[PDB]
């Protein structure tokens, strides 16, 4: 159970919490703004999934400040996670290449 594998699991676990909180917070921030689309929990959930994967569909995006701040937190958490997996993967391959040359 090496650091990079511990950290990736921690990042993935953390991301799911950021997603769930992110869905919940979006709805609480958006409701009140006229025309806001992120006003239901299941909708905001899949919005979060899209946003965490840096994907935007049409005008399915927050309009409020805090809603957009949530979006920022979701995005950053998303990229950090899928950047940490790559880093963890890279560490695994470089470790084996060190074993490959007997180094």
């Amino acid at each position: 159970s090496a650091l990079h594998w511990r950290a990736a699991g921690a990042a993935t676990v953390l991301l799911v919490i950021v997603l769930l909180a992110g869905s919940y917070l979006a709805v609480l921030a958006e409701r009140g703004a006229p025309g806001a689309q992120l006003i239901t929990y299941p909708r905001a959930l899949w919005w979060s999934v899209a946003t965490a994967t840096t994907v935007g569909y049409g005008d399915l995006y927050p309009v409020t400040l805090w809603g957009r701040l949530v979006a920022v937190v979701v995005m950053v958490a998303g990229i950090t996670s899928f950047g940490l997996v790559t880093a963890a993967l890279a560490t695994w391959f470089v470790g084996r290449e060190q074993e490959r040359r007997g180094h």
Partner: antibody
Amino acid sequence: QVQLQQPGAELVKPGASVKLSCKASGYTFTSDWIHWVKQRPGHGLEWIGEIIPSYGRANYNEKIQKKATLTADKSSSTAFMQLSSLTSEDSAVYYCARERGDGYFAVWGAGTTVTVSS
Amino acid sequence: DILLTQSPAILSVSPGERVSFSCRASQSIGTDIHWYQQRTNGSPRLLIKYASESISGIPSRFSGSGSGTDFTLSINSVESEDIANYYCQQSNRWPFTFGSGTKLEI
């Protein structure tokens, strides 16, 4: 079982204020939203507001005048609607409804028949 | 604010026949719409959630149709207990809005 409970009727003098109550049993999540709907005699349904009891943030219909102000007591699971400066146009049945935060209002209240007269 | 339009206002039908209430939104709302039944003196009762999905306890005679702007609530074999006002309610954008209503008559 009956989920939401409202007083049957409320009498108010013209210009005076009134607080309306709405307690709830059964499943009461943190994510729950309590709305309030206005129905005049022989008229359609009219959304007035919504409030999440666990945080106390309320939203109001800005199309009509903001006469109401929403508050909620956490321990009693009861939502309140503070209406002030009432005219004859405020004489209506007022419903409270439980919304799981997914659009539809699943369970409704009995309704409070408010009459504005001297 | 989404404007919902229920045409016609009053709907008359023969007993045992099929009936259809239409509700049109001011703009595309997908399937984010809900139907409510309200009889005399009674409080609103949920019939069909999300355009077509049925609620348990609700008769199998009730079924929902439509997407986009055109939406329809339909009853097969209309009986006495169905005489009521019928309301469509959207949940696509804030704030939530209701239709004017459609009264059923036998």
